[PDB]
Design a protein around this ligand. Structure first.
Ligand SMILES: Nc1ncnc2c1ncn2[C@@H]1O[C@H](C(=O)NCCO)[C@@H](O)[C@H]1O
Length: 225
C-alpha cells in the first residue's frame, strides 16, 4: 500500500478563485483578526443544523456521537487552538471540494469594492469565513468524520493542501475539528480569558451549546452560551 505516498495523490492545489479569495479575506480583516473565531463557530453551527435536519429523516443519523455541541480547547503548550463540532462532518471528497474550490464573481468584485469598508459582514454572509483563520494561523488543519466515510485530515499553509486518511482512526465519532497552529504573534488566543470573551460574544446567538475547556486546579467544559 505504498502507491499513495509514492505518487503523492494526497496533495492538491487550491483553485485560482480560492487563492484570490484568501488574499481578499486576509487583507481586509487585517485589523479585525478576532473575527476568525466567530466564523469557525458559525461554520460549526451550520454543520450542526445539517446533521439535525438529517436526523429528522434518518433514524441512524446520530449513531456515531449522540451529542450536538461545539467544544473549544486551547493547547498553549502545543500552540494550538481546537474548535470541534459534532455536526454532519465531511467526507474525503468534501474536504477536497468544499475547502479547495468554490455568485463567486459578484462576491469577487463586491469584496474588492468593499475594501477600496468593512468586509466582516460580506464574508459572514457568503459563508467563506473559514479562510479568515489564516489571519491568525500559519497552518490550518481540519480533522473530519462523516457518516458516509472514514475519518480524514485536511491540512494547509495556504500554499497548497492535502487530505489523508486519519491514521488515528475514527476518534471524532462524527463531526469536525478545526485545528489552528497559531502564529507567534497570535499567542493571545491561547489565553482562556481571551477565548472565553470571544466565544461568549460570538456564541451568544448560536442555538447549540458551546463549551470551552477551562480550569477552576481542575479542568472541565464550561458552558459559554
Ligand atoms: N465545521 C464544519 N463542518 C462541516 N462542514 C464545514 C465546516 N466548516 C466548513 N465546512 C464546509 O466547507 C465549506 C467552506 O467553509 N468553504 C470555505 C469557503 O468557501 C462550507 O461551505 C462547508 O460546506
Amino acid at each position: 500500500g505504498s502507491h499513495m505516498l509514492r505518487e503523492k495523490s494526497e496533495k492538491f492545489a487550491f483553485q485560482a478563485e480560492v487563492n484570490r479569495m484568501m488574499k481578499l479575506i486576509i487583507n481586509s480583516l487585517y485589523k479585525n483578526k478576532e473575527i476568525f473565531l466567530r466564523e469557525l463557530i458559525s461554520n460549526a453551527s451550520d454543520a450542526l443544523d445539517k446533521i439535525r435536519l438529517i436526523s429528522l429523516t434518518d433514524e441512524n443519523a446520530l449513531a456515531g456521537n449522540e451529542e450536538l455541541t461545539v467544544k473549544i480547547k486551547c493547547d498553549k503548550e502545543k500552540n494550538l487552538l481546537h474548535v470541534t463540532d459534532t455536526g454532519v462532518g465531511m467526507t474525503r471528497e468534501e474536504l477536497v471540494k468544499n475547502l479547495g474550490t468554490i455568485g463567486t464573481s459578484e462576491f469577487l468584485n463586491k469584496m474588492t469594492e468593499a475594501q477600496e469598508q468593512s468586509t466582516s459582514e460580506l464574508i459572514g454572509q457568503f459563508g467563506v469565513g473559514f479562510y479568515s483563520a489564516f489571519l491568525v494561523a500559519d497552518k490550518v488543519i481540519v480533522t473530519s468524520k462523516h457518516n458516509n466515510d472514514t475519518q480524514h485530515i485536511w491540512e494547509s499553509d495556504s500554499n497548497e493542501f492535502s487530505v489523508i486518511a486519519d491514521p488515528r482512526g475514527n476518534t471524532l465519532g462524527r463531526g469536525t475539528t478545526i485545528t489552528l497552529v497559531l502564529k507567534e504573534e497570535a499567542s493571545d488566543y491561547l489565553e482562556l480569558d481571551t477565548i472565553k470573551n470571544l466565544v461568549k460574544k460570538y456564541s451568544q446567538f448560536i442555538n447549540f451549546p458551546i463549551y470551552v475547556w477551562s480550569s477552576k486546579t481542575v479542568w472541565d467544559w464550561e458552558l459559554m452560551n
